[PDB]
Structures are given as C-alpha cells and as structure tokens.
Ligand binder design. Structure first.
Ligand SMILES: *C(=O)[C@@H](NC(=O)/C(=N\OC(C)(C)C(=O)O)c1csc(N)n1)[C@@H]1N=C(C(=O)O)C(=C)CS1
Length: 261
C-alpha cells in the first residue's frame, strides 16, 4: 500500500500519536503525516540553541573558545559531560558538542543562559523564517511533554524545513554550518532511533529527544550513497504520563519513508 497508508497503520498500532516530515532534497518532494500539528520537541530543541550560538560566532571570532565556568549547582537530571568538568571550565564549542552529541542538559542550559534565555532561542528560529518553533523553558522542564501544552513545541514540517536550512541551506555561514553537521554526525544517542531504520552504511546526523508521555523524538539529516540528502523528523507521543519511550516506532517510521531511496 501507499506510504501514507503505511504511516497511518503504524500510528494505529502505536498506541499514540506519530508525526513525520521527510523532505527529499532531490526534488523538494515531501512525505508528511500530522506535519502541521504540534509536538513537544524535548531535547531536539538543543539543535536550535546550539545553532543560535553558532550564528553569534559568525561575528565574534573568540566566541566558540569562550570559557564557561561549570559549578555543582549547574547539574540537573542528566549531565554526563558537564559533571566531569565541575569546578573547571568548558568552552562554548565544548558545550555545543556535549548538548548535541550526549544530550547533556547542563550544557543546553549553559547555551540558553549565554544567549539570554529561552525566548532568545525562539527569536533565532524566527530569524530563519520558522514561525512555529517556540522555546519556553530550560532543561529539564522543557521535556514535560504534556499533551496540548504549547510550551517547547514545534511541528514536524517546521522542524524539517528548519533543520534543512540549518544543515544544508541558508541559515548559517559555511564554517558554522559544517560545524553543526559535524556535531550531528557524531551524535552518540541515536543508534536505536532513525538510524536503526536505515542502511547501516548511510551517513546520518541526528538529535534525539525523550520526555514524559513516552515522548520519543529524532530529527535527522541523511546522506544516501547514490542520492541527494533526505531530512527527516519523527516525533512520537503517548496519552499516559509514564508511558515507556518508543525508539522502535521512530526506526519503523524511518524504514517506511526511506524505502526505495
Ligand atoms: C531531552 O530530551 C532530555 N530528556 C530529559 O531530560 C527527560 N527524560 O529523558 C530521559 C532521562 C532519558 C528519560 O528518562 O526519558 C526528561 C526531563 S523532564 C521529564 N519528564 N523527562 C535528554 N535527552 C536524551 C535523548 O533522548 O536525547 C538523553 C539521552 C538524555 S536526557
């Protein structure tokens, strides 16, 4: 059956709500499912915060190497990199890397604080023409993912469009675009998500997120061996607060929409 029928069936089996946007950059075609509906981004929002700092670095050649003091009081619920550096410093570049490649929540908070608060991340998204994205809170509370709560949400299509702009398009100057792509390609947290639904040897950059309501997300740029890149957002959320996260659904969605590519 059709891709749309396959996605609807996946959602029907899932016990939740699935959002997919794939952009095929060969022809700008799209595979869209609930793509204009809002989902909690959870830690996928870290891409926007890191990119906002990269944008600033365009016009400040010392920014990425700027020291940031890490204190015990900065630690939150999940901070495997920052905790190694308590009482020392990390650079803004190191905080970008930690936020993106390990989903270090303390690192995300340092980026947000540097920028001047969640609303500055929203303003950066808007500067890229993304009217949908909003960041409202710091970590960990940006991951509460309560159904119908607009805070810290976007739509799959808005995020796919912005991720394409960030990684392959016009958002960032070249050195900064390349840095973002390097970070995403080196992600350690995404093995079981979009990547698991794709050929093992395809190059992928991604950022995952997970929150309450079993909210399980991944946003990716995918480089096939013989085809133009694909940009893929897979968001998934469930009705019950303490639902298990479901990375397998993201892998399954990725397999469905990349068939034939
Ligand atoms: C981003 O999504 C972050 N998520 C969280 O901090 C929340 N939970 O995530 C973990 C701890 C993995 C979970 O048990 O689901 C969270 C904060 S408030 C709330 N109700 N939940 C980070 N993201 C990931 C990721 O999947 O990318 C992590 C690897 C580290 S936490």
């Amino acid at each position: 059956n059709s891709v749309q029928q396959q996605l609807e069936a996946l959602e029907k089996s899932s016990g939740g709500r699935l959002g997919v946007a794939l952009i095929n950059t060969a022809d700008n075609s799209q595979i869209l499912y609930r793509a204009d509906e809002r989902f909690a981004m959870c830690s996928t929002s870290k891409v926007m915060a890191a990119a906002a700092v990269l944008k600033q670095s365009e016009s400040d050649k010392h920014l990425l190497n700027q020291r940031v003091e890490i204190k015990k009081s900065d630690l939150v619920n999940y901070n495997p990199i920052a905790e190694k550096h308590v009482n020392g410093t990390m650079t803004l570049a190191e905080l970008g890397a930690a936020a993106l490649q390990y989903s270090d929540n303390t690192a995300m908070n340092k980026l947000i604080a540097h920028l001047g608060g969640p609303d500055k991340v929203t303003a950066f998204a808007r500067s890229l023409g993304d009217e949908t994205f909003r960041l409202d809170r710091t970590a960990p509370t940006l991951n509460t993912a309560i159904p119908g709560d607009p805070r810290d949400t976007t739509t799959p299509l808005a995020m796919a469009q912005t991720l394409k702009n960030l990684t392959l398009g016009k958002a960032l100057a070249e050195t900064q675009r390349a840095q973002l792509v390097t970070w995403l390609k080196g992600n350690t947290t995404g093995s079981a998500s979009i990547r698991a639904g794709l050929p093992k040897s395809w190059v992928v950059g991604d950022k995952t997120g997970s929150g309450d309501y079993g909210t399980t997300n991944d946003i990716a740029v995918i480089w096939p061996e013989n085809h133009a890149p694909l940009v893929l957002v897979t968001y998934f959320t469930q009705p019950e607060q303490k639902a298990e996260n479901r990375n397998d659904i993201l892998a399954a969605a990725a397999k469905i929409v990349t068939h034939g590519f």
